[PDB]
C-alpha cells in the first residue's frame, strides 16, 4: 500500500472514530480521494468519492474531509456492523492509474460476550469403510474471538492429530472455528467416549459422543 493509514483503530459502540489517509501533493493533495469498506467474506463497497460525497445508499453516519495531503473518514454512532477493513485511494498521475492506502482494521469495543455453540459430529459410515475416522467439532456464535479446544478419549487428553482453525469473524461480528481429530477406525471403536471441550472466557462447553451409540 502506497497511501499511509493506521493499521488499527478502536472505538466503543455508539461513539465516533476517525481514520486518516496520508499521501503526497501528486495523489491525495490533488483531491478526488475515495474510501472503500471491506467486511470479511464479502465484496468491497464504495463509501466516499470526491473527498466528501457519500456513495448511493451509504448512511450519513459516514463522512469524510481532506486537508492538503491528509484525508479523514469519520464514522459516527459506531455499530458492530462497522467492523471491517477501510481503504482510501487516489488517482496517481492519470485518471486510469490508482494507488490504495495500506488499510485500517476497525475494532468496535463494548460488544456483549457470547458463549460458543458447540456441535460434535462422529465419523460417517462412508469414511469408516475406508479405515479413517474424522471427528469434527464445530464452534460458532462466540464473542470475543478466542477459544481453546481440548479433545478427550476416556479421561485421556489427546494432542496427536488435532487440527484447530483460527477463529474467523462471521458477518454478525461473532466468531467461528472448527477442530478436526483424525483417527483410524480401530482408535474410534476402541474407546467408550470422545469429547470436544471448548473453553471461552474461563467457561468450558463439553459435547460427548460414544462409538457404541454412533456406529
Amino acid at each position: 500500500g502506497v497511501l499511509t493509514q493506521p493499521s488499527s483503530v478502536s472505538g466503543s459502540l455508539g461513539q465516533r472514530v476517525s481514520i486518516t489517509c496520508s499521501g503526497s501533493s501528486s495523489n491525495v493533495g490533488r483531491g478526488y480521494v475515495s474510501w472503500y469498506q471491506m467486511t470479511p467474506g464479502s465484496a468491497p463497497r464504495t463509501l466516499i468519492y470526491g473527498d466528501t460525497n457519500r456513495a448511493s445508499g451509504v448512511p450519513d453516519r459516514f463522512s469524510a474531509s481532506r486537508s492538503g495531503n491528509t484525508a479523514t473518514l469519520t464514522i459516527s454512532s459506531l455499530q458492530a456492523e462497522d467492523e471491517a477493513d477501510y481503504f482510501c485511494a487516489s488517482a496517481e498521475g492519470s485518471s486510469s492509474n490508482a494507488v490504495f492506502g495500506s488499510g485500517t482494521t476497525l475494532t468496535v469495543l463494548g460488544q456483549p460476550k457470547s458463549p460458543p455453540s458447540v456441535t460434535l459430529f462422529p465419523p460417517s459410515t462412508e469414511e469408516l469403510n475406508g479405515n479413517k475416522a474424522t471427528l469434527v467439532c464445530l464452534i460458532s456464535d462466540f464473542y470475543p474471538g478466542s477459544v481453546t479446544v481440548v479433545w478427550k478419549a476416556d479421561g485421556s487428553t489427546i494432542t496427536r492429530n488435532v487440527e484447530t482453525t483460527r477463529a474467523s469473524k462471521q458477518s454478525n461480528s461473532k466468531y467461528a472455528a472448527s477442530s478436526y481429530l483424525s483417527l483410524t477406525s480401530s482408535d474410534w471403536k476402541s474407546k467408550g467416549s470422545y469429547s470436544c471441550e471448548v473453553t471461552h472466557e474461563g467457561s468450558t462447553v463439553t459435547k460427548t459422543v460414544k462409538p457404541s451409540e454412533c456406529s
Partner: protein, 255 residues
C-alpha cells in the same frame, strides 16, 4: 436494479502460463460502462491493474503494463483481462468493477471557469462583452478516479501443485442426543486442493440456519472444511470444486 459484475475464469493456473479472466456486466441502464480490474493478495492491500473506458481506451498500473492486456466484447457486455507469465506472487482475489475516470479543468483561487459570464477562456475574471476584456490563466488538469460498483471477486491460485477433488462425507449429530427437538446435519468436504469449494444445501432451497466454516490446511498438505444446518424433507449438500470440474450432491440421512 443497477449494474452487476460477475468475474469468471480458472481458480488454478501453473507458473508462467497466461491468466485470462472475464467480467460480465448485466442490468446497466447504459449502453456501456468503463470497467476496471483490482486484485488483493492474501495479507496485502488492494492493487490497481487497469481499465478500459466506453471509447476502448486502456489505462494500466505502470508497474504491470508489459504483462497486462484488457479487451472488450460489447456484443456480450464482457471485458477480459490477460496477465502473462504469472508467478505465485500473482495469487490473489481478482475483482472487476465499474470505474469513474474524468479530467477536470482546475482554476486558481478567485478565478471562474464555465460559459456563464467568457466561454472561450479556461479561467477568467471581469475585474465584458468579448474574451479579450477578462483577466485569465490556463487551467491545471486534475485527475479523478473511483470505483462505483464492485464484482464478487474470483480467487486465483498460481501453483505447480496438483488438484485433488474433495471426498464429501455426510454428518449427523443425532447419536449425541437422539431425543433432541432439532437435528444438526452437515457435510465434511475432505482433502481437496486448491481452494475454493462452494457449498449449498438442497440446491440453495435451504439457506437459513446454514453455517459453512473456513477451510483448515491439514498435515496431509490438503484442505478440509465443514458445512452444517440445524432443522427442527430429504437433505442434500451440493459441493462444487471448480479447479477439478467436480460437483458432489451428498444425501444426508436425518434420527
Amino acid at each position: 436494479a443497477q449494474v452487476q459484475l460477475r468475474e469468471s475464469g480458472p481458480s488454478l493456473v501453473k507458473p508462467s502460463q497466461t491468466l485470462s479472466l472475464t467480467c460480465t456486466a448485466s442490468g446497466s441502464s447504459l449502453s456501456d460502462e468503463a470497467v476496471g480490474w483490482v486484485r488483493q493478495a492474501p495479507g496485502k492491500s488492494l492493487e490497481w491493474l487497469g481499465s478500459i473506458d466506453t471509447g476502448g481506451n486502456t489505462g494500466y498500473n505502470p508497474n504491470l503494463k508489459t504483462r497486462l492486456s484488457i479487451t472488450k466484447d460489447n456484443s456480450k457486455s464482457q471485458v477480459s483481462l490477460s496477465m502473462s507469465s504469472v508467478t505465485p506472487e500473482d495469487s490473489a482475489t481478482y475483482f472487476c468493477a465499474t470505474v469513474h475516470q474524468e479530467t477536470h479543468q482546475t482554476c486558481p483561487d478567485g478565478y471562474n471557469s464555465g460559459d456563464d459570464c467568457c466561454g472561450t477562456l479556461d479561467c477568467w475574471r471581469c475585474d465584458c462583452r468579448a474574451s479579450t476584456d477578462y483577466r485569465s490563466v490556463t487551467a491545471t488538469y486534475t485527475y479523478e478516479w473511483y470505483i462505483d460498483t464492485w464484482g464478487q471477486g474470483l480467487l486465483v491460485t498460481v501453483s505447480s501443485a496438483s488438484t485433488t477433488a474433495p471426498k464429501v462425507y455426510p454428518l449427523s449429530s443425532c447419536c449425541g442426543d437422539k431425543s433432541s427437538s432439532t437435528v444438526t446435519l452437515g457435510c465434511l468436504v475432505s482433502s481437496y486442493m486448491p481452494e475454493p469449494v462452494t457449498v449449498t444445501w438442497n440446491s440453495g432451497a435451504l439457506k437459513s440456519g446454514v453455517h459453512t466454516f473456513p477451510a483448515v490446511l491439514q498435515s496431509s498438505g490438503l484442505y478440509s472444511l465443514s458445512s452444517m444446518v440445524t432443522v427442527p424433507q430429504t437433505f442434500t449438500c451440493n459441493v462444487a470444486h471448480p479447479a477439478s470440474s467436480t460437483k458432489v450432491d451428498k444425501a444426508v440421512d436425518p434420527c
